[PDB]
Each structure stands twice: as C-alpha cells, then as structure tokens.
Amino acid sequence: MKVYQTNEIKNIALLGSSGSGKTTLVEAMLFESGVIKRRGSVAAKNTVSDYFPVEQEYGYSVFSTVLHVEWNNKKLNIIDCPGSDDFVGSTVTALNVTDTAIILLNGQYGVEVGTQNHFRYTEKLNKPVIFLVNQLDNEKCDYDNILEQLKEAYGSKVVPIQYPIATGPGFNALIDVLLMKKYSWKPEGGAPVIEDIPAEEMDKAMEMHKALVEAAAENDEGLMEKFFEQDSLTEDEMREGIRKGLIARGMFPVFCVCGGKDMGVRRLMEFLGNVVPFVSEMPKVENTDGKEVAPDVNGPESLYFFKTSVEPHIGEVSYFKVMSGKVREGDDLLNADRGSKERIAQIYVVAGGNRVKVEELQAGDIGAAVKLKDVKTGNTLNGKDCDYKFNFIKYPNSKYSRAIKPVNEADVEKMMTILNRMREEDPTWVIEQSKELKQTLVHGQGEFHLRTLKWRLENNEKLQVKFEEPKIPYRETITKAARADYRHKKQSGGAGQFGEVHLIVEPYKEGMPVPDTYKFNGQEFKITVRGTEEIPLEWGGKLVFINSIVGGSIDARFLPAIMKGIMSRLEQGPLTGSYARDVRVIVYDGKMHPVDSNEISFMLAGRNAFSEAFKNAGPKILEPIYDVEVFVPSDRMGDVMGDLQGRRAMIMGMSSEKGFEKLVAKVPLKEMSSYSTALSSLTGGRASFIMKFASYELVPTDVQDKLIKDFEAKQTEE
Ligand SMILES: Nc1nc2c(ncn2[C@@H]2O[C@H](COP(=O)(O)OP(=O)(O)OP(=O)(O)O)[C@@H](O)[C@H]2O)c(=O)[nH]1
Numbered sequence: 250m251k252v253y254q255t256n257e258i259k260n261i262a263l264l265g266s267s268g269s270g271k272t273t274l275v276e277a278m279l280f281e282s283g284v285i286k287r288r289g290s291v292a293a294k295n296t297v298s299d300y301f302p303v304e305q306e307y308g309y310s311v312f313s314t315v316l317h318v319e320w321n322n323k324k325l326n327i328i329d330c331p332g333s334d335d336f337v338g339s340t341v342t343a344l345n346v347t348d349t350a351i352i353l354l355n356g357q358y359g360v361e362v363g364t365q366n367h368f369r370y371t372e373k374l375n376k377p378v379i380f381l382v383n384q385l386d387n388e389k390c391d392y393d394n395i396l397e398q399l400k401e402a403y404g405s406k407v408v409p410i411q412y413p414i415a416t417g418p419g420f421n422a423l424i425d426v427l428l429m430k431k432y433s434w435k436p437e438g439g440a441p442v443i444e445d446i447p448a449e450e451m452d453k454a455m456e457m458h459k460a461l462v463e464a465a466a467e468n469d470e471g472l473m474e475k476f477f478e479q480d481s482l483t484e485d486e487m488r489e490g491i492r493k494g495l496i497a498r499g500m501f502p503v504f505c506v507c508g509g510k511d512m513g514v515r516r517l518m519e520f521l522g523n524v525v526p527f528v529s530e531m532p533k534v535e536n537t538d539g540k541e542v543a544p545d546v547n548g549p550e551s552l553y554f555f556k557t558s559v560e561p562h563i564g565e566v567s568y569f570k571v572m573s574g575k576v577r578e579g580d581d582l583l584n585a586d587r588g589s590k591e592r593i594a595q596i597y598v599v600a601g602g603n604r605v606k607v608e609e610l611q612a613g614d615i616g617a618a619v620k621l622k623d624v625k626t627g628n629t630l631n632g633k634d635c636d637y638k639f640n641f642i643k644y645p646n647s648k649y650s651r652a653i654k655p656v657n658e659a660d661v662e663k664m665m666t667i668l669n670r671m672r673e674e675d676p677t678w679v680i681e682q683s684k685e686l687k688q689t690l691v692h693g694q695g696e697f698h699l700r701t702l703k704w705r706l707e708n709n710e711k712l713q714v715k716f717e718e719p720k721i722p723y724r725e726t727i728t729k730a731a732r733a734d735y736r737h738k739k740q741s742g743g744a745g746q747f748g749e750v751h752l753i754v755e756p757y758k759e760g761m762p763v764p765d766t767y768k769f770n771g772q773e774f775k776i777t778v779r780g781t782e783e784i785p786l787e788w789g790g791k792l793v794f795i796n797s798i799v800g801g802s803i804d805a806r807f808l809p810a811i812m813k814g815i816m817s818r819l820e821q822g823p824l825t826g827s828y829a830r831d832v833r834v835i836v837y838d839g840k841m842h843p844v845d846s847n848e849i850s851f852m853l854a855g856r857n858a859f860s861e862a863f864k865n866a867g868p869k870i871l872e873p874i875y876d877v878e879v880f881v882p883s884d885r886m887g888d889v890m891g892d893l894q895g896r897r898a899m900i901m902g903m904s905s906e907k908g909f910e911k912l913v914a915k916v917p918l919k920e921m922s923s924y925s926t927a928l929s930s931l932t933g934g935r936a937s938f939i940m941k942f943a944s945y946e947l948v949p950t951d952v953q954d955k956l957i958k959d960f961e962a963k964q965t966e967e
C-alpha cells in the first residue's frame with residue numbers, strides 16, 4: 250500500500266513476562282487500527298497474531314511476530330516477542346532489529362523475574378525502555394504499590410506519565426499528566442472522553458506534572474527562557490525532551506492500559522507515534538569490515554534477512570529490514586554469501602499472517618518476500634556496488650543440549666532437511682553433527698525449548714523422533730614413563746618381515762628438557778638427540794618424536810614406517826576413549842635386515858609395542874571442563890555453592906555487585922547434561938550461566954573405573 254518515508258516509520262519491540270496480557274494488547278492495536286474487523290480472544294484462538302499451530306496449541310506465543318499498525322501519518326513496526334524465558338533468541342533478534350523496547354507490567358503480579366531478564370537484555374543491547382502496566386481490570390492490583398515497587402527496584406530516573414483513578418473491574422477512567430487531561434470510556438470500551446480532570450485530583454496532578462517536567466528538563470536542558478525556570482513548554486517539546494532522555498536511557502516512562510476493555514489504546518498509539526527515537530536518530534550499526542552503515546534513502550540497495558517463518562499454508566515467508574536505500578520489484582540483488590544474484594519479485598508488507606503487497610520500501614523498514622531460493626537466516630542481499638556481509642547480531646551461548654534421533658533409523662535425510670529448515674526458523678536451534686561422536690547434536694536454550702521443537706516435529710509434520718542423552722568426548726593419556734620392547738619376524742607369508750623396535754613412552758609437556766637418562770628396571774639409558782620433529786593432532790594435543798638413533802644404528806628411511814604404526818595405534822585408544830594427546834616417544838634400539846626389513850613389519854611392531862607400552866604406562870582419562878559464569882542473586886548463594894560442591898566443581902571466585910553475585914568455576918561436562926534445568930528450578934529462573942571450553946584435566950579413580958567397566962560391558966555384545 251501507500252509508501253512511508255523513513256521519517257514516519259518506527260520500529261517497536263514489545264517485551265514482557267508470560268501471562269502479562271501483551272499478545273492480546275497486540276490484537277487490541279490490530280482491532281483499533283481497522284485492519285481487522287473483530288477483536289478476537291486468545292481463548293477462542295482466533296487472534297491474528299497467533300497463527301502458528303503450536304502458538305494456539307500452547308495457549309501462548311511461541312515465535313516472535315512482526316506486524317504493522319497505521320495511524321495519523323505514522324506507521325509502527327510492532328514486533329511481539331514470545332515473552333518466555335526459554336525463547337531468548339527471538340527476543341534478542343527483535344532487540345537487534347528494532348529501535349525501542351517496551352515493557353508491560355502485570356498489575357496482579359507486579360514486577361516479575363522475566364521483567365528483570367528483559368531489562369538485563371535491553372541493558373546489554375543498550376535500547377530505550379518504556380514501562381507499561383497491564384491488567385487494571387483485576388481487583389488484585391494497586392497502582393501505587395507497583396509504582397513504589399518499581400521506584401525501589403530501579404533508579405529514580407523513571408517517572409509515571411498517567412495516574413489511573415479507578416482500579417479493578419470498576420476501572421472506567423484514568424488521568425493523563427503529560428497532556429494534562431482525563432480520559433474516560435464506555436463500559437464496552439473504545440471511545441475516550443477527553444473531559445478535564447476534576448479539582449479533586451488537581452493537587453496531585455500538578456505535583457506529578459511538576460516532577461515530570463523537572464525530570465524532563467534534567468534529561469536535556471533546552472535553554473528555552475522558561476523551560477526549567479518557570480514551567481515546561483506545554484507539551485509540544487516535552488515529547489522531544491522525553492525522546493532525548495530515552496536516547497541515553499535517562500528516563501523510563503510508565504503507562505497503564507486494559508487489554509480486555511481497550512482502555513486508552515488510542516492514547517498509547519498517539520504517544521508512541523509522537524515520541525520515540527527515529528530510525529536515523531539512534532546509534533548507527535556497523536558492518537563486518539567496521540565501516541559505518543548509515544541508513545538512508547539515497548544510499549545503495551542492501552537488505553538483511555533475519556526471520557524465516559515457515560508456517561504451513563502461508564508459504565516460506567521471509568522478512569527483512571531495509572539497511573539502506575530502497576527496493577523495487579524486479580530488481581536483481583547480489584547475495585553476499587553463497588552469491589547467486591537473486592532476482593526479486595512482488596514484495597509484501599505483512600501485519601502478521603495476512604500480508605499486503607507494496608510497491609516500494611524505504612530504508613530502515615521491515616518488509617517480506619516469498620518464493621526465495623538462496624536466502625537463509627542471517628544471509629544479507631545487496632546490490633552490485635554495496636559489498637556488505639552484515640553479521641552484527643549475536644545470540645546467547647546454548648545453555649542446553651541433547652542428541653536427536655528418529656524412532657526408525659531410516660529417515661536420517663528427513664532429520665537433516667527439517668532440522669535445517671527449523672534452524673533458519675530460529676538460529677537458536679543450533680544443529681551439529683559430531684563426526685567423531687557419530688551423533689547429531691541439537692543445542693537449545695532449555696528443556697522447554699527442546700520440548701517446543703519436539704512438538705513442532707511430532708505434530709506440525711507428523712514425524713517421530715526421540716531425545717537421548719548426548720555422548721561425551723573422552724581423551725586418554727599417560728602419566729608414568731615405561732619401556733616398550735618388541736621384535737618381529739614372519740616367514741609365513743612372503744618376505745621374512747623382520748622387525749625389532751625398542752622405544753620409551755613419556756607424557757609430553759610444553760618445555761620438558763627431555764632428560765637423556767632413565768633408570769628403569771635397574772637399567773639406565775643414554776639418549777642422543779639427532780632429529781627433533783613435532784607432529785600435532787587434529788583432535789588436539791601434540792606428539793614429539795625426538796630420535797635417539799645410535800650413530801646411524803637404524804636408518805632414518807624407515808622412520809615413516811614407525812610413525813605410521815604409531816598413529817595407526819594412536820587413533821584408537823587402548824581403552825575407551827577416542828584418542829590420546831601429549832605423548833612424547835623416544836626410540837633407541839632396532840635391527841635392520843637386508844631382505845627381511847619391510848614397512849609392514851614396522852607397522853605391526855610399532856602398533857603392538859605402543860599398545861603394550863600404554864598397557865605398561867599408567868592410563869588416565871581426561872574429562873572436558875567448561876567454565877561456568879553463574880549470574881545469581883545472593884539469596885541462593887549457599888544453595889548454588891552447595892549444588893556445585895555436589896557437582897565436583899572447583900570454586901574460582903565470587904563477584905559482588907548490586908544484588909546479583911557472579912560466580913566462576915571449573916566444572917566437568919559429564920554432570921552438566923542437565924545443569925540448566927536444576928539451576929532454573931533452584932533459583933526460579935532468576936539466574937543464567939555461560940559455558941565455554943577450557944582444558945581437559947584428570948578424573949578420580951572411581952569414575953574412570955566405572956567408565957572402563959561400562960566400556961567392556963558394551964563391548965561384550967560384539
Ligand atoms: N482479566 C483479564 N485478562 C487479560 C486481559 N488481557 C490479557 N489477559 C490475559 O492474558 C492472557 C494471554 O497472555 P498474552 O496476551 O498472550 O501475553 P503472554 O503472557 O506473553 O502470552 P504470549 O504472548 O501469547 O506468549 C489471557 O489468558 C488473559 O487471561 C484483560 O484485559 N483482562
């Protein structure tokens with residue numbers, strides 16, 4: 250439909266805890282915009298915002314939705330996040346793409362922990378925040394109570410903008426303070442009455458109006474003659490002052506609304522359209538190369554694609570935000586990655602579900618295209634002159650993982666296909682195929698996240714899968730040096746296959762001086778360094794073959810045979826464990842036969858000698874250790890330290906700040922297969938953690954003995 254200038258386009262992302270009456274409020278905006286006819290109810294599951302089958306099946310939103318609402322010369326790009334704790338990826342994508350964040354407060358519950366999580370996310374992403382109160386129709390609500398709760402929760406920089414009078418089911422009016430008005434509605438709701446406030450609330454109205462204008466002046470001093478001295482500049486420049494304060498997060502406004510009764514949603518529309526940071530008036534995004542990318546109509550034609558909703562019967566719709574320039578139907582756009590020079594077609598502006606075709610899209614706006622071929626999530630499409638490969642969006646580390654497998658080992662290709670399709674659906678569904686582990690790894694954000702994926706596989710497509718606990722990457726090694734001796738000769742086949750290998754194994758460190766004397770078994774030996782070569786391992790670790798050939802006792806021409814034997818024994822551990830690392834090998838004695846010396850003899854000799862050397866040496870198992878950064882309030886510091894102590898953890902350091910204390914610990918992955926669920930249960934979901942690999946380390950005797958016993962228990966079947 251009608252094209253809008255970038256100066257009249259705003260991007261808004263709603264944020265709030267579950268059970269906050271937000272998605273409904275979205276239907277309130279859709280109904281009052283006139284784009285839809287009736288105002289549906291989430292109970293009836295007829296809401297336009299909820300169309301994914303799981304989204305109405307669960308009774309709450311699962312994916313973030315994008316939609317447009319039109320008003321007087323202003324159109325708002327409303328993005329409704331799922332609002333749950335385990336759908337962080339949609340929220341962070343919305344924050345990265347949007348311009349401003351909105352927080353909705355439930356009057357019944359007041360400030361909730363999900364509100365804290367969303368506030369932390371937007372603080373990390375540095376976006377403006379406006380507070381809002383929902384559910385004023387519930388008796389279990391007190392505007393003063395939530396006001397003081399938020400006063401004592403965050404800084405004094407915040408300030409309310411409206412003063413509701415009635416409460417609970419009897420709510421039929423409220424007072425606007427920014428514009429100095431009182432609003433009332435019919436019991437049906439929808440038509441505000443701009444009748445002025447009575448003199449009863451005149452005193453408090455003036456008090457909080459003076460407080461608000463003083464706060465706005467402190468946000469930015471406009472130097473106008475009466476601005477901070479006498480009174481505010483009515484309301485016209487108050488919007489600009491509020492926006493400027495929101496630029497630096499110097500003030501967070503507070504609003505109230507009733508979703509069911511539609512109390513003053515028009516007031517919200519007017520306020521949001523009036524005051525909000527502009528698309529250009531915000532800290533501009535950089536590119537991968539670090540060159541500034543200022544959104545402008547006169548700029549080149551580049552597009553970035555983030556959302557790839559694949560809801561059935563509506564097509565593989567792919568949204569996108571216009572980074573710079575414009576876009577027209579029929580244009581040919583280059584693809585930054587796996588470039589194919591995609592030729593575009595009829596574009597559509599979608600209000601969620603139903604979409605409306607549009608002719609031209611300006612920079613800094615969200616559009617949607619269909620029937621694409623080589624466009625995936627995170628891929629960006631650009632013109633010929635504008636080489637951009639935008640990768641400015643970062644997602645939180647996968648806090649949970651599980652191994653997937655269908656009920657029948659006959660649809661592996663279907664697993665790959667649909668799992669990839671879901672990957673694009675939300676990049677958080679990190680899919681990985683560990684070739685060494687022979688398992689397909691799925692990384693999510695929690696138990697409920699994987700439950701959601703399981704439902705989408707089972708019901709949306711009628712596909713059967715199971716979840717199994719992922720395998721653990723174990724690496725073996727040695728600690729005690731030992732002497733390995735072997736002699737080989739086989740006349741049963743062809744040549745004599747003569748072989749004689751004598752070698753010593755030793756754990757390798759970064760700077761050992763490799764001493765030349767080793768008194769083992771009442772026998773000392775002398776080692777002479779002639780050729781030093783280090784061969785690294787692709788699975789990590791290093792191997793060294795400092796030779797000790799006695800003045801040419803064994804020809805170096807056969808050394809690759811010993812090396813091939815060594816790695817052929819090495820790639821399989823003598824016990825359970827994929828490989829071994831940090832092993833220093835010294836070979837001293839050997840014999841050479843003019844006709845019976847051959848490479849296969851040294852193959853077998855090295856293999857068996859190294860196997861029996863590991864048998865003689867002390868085998869040890871190394872468990873991967875992942876650093877954990879728990880961000881938890883002090884009320885559960887004892888519980889978390891006790892749980893970690895029960896999780897064979899090593900305390901590193903406790904950080905102190907505000908009310909949440911950061912924790913550092915070295916923790917084995919073996920007991921972290923379900924750590925996120927336990928942490929969420931203990932802290933009520935009030936804490937998060939970050940995982941990252943550090944260094945393999947040793948394990949106690951009991952766990953390795955159990956692992957070995959299970960290894961032969963499994964092997965006994967074959
Ligand atoms: N009593 C009452 N309840 C409301 C009102 N508005 C919303 N709700 C409640 O809000 C619930 C739906 O929550 P949503 O609006 O979808 O917000 P959410 O918690 O983030 O859920 P999703 O966005 O769908 O994930 C409904 O079951 C209603 O009970 C209202 O005006 N009055």
Ligand SMILES: [Mg+2]
Binds near residue numbers: 269270272310332
């Ligand atoms: Mg909602």
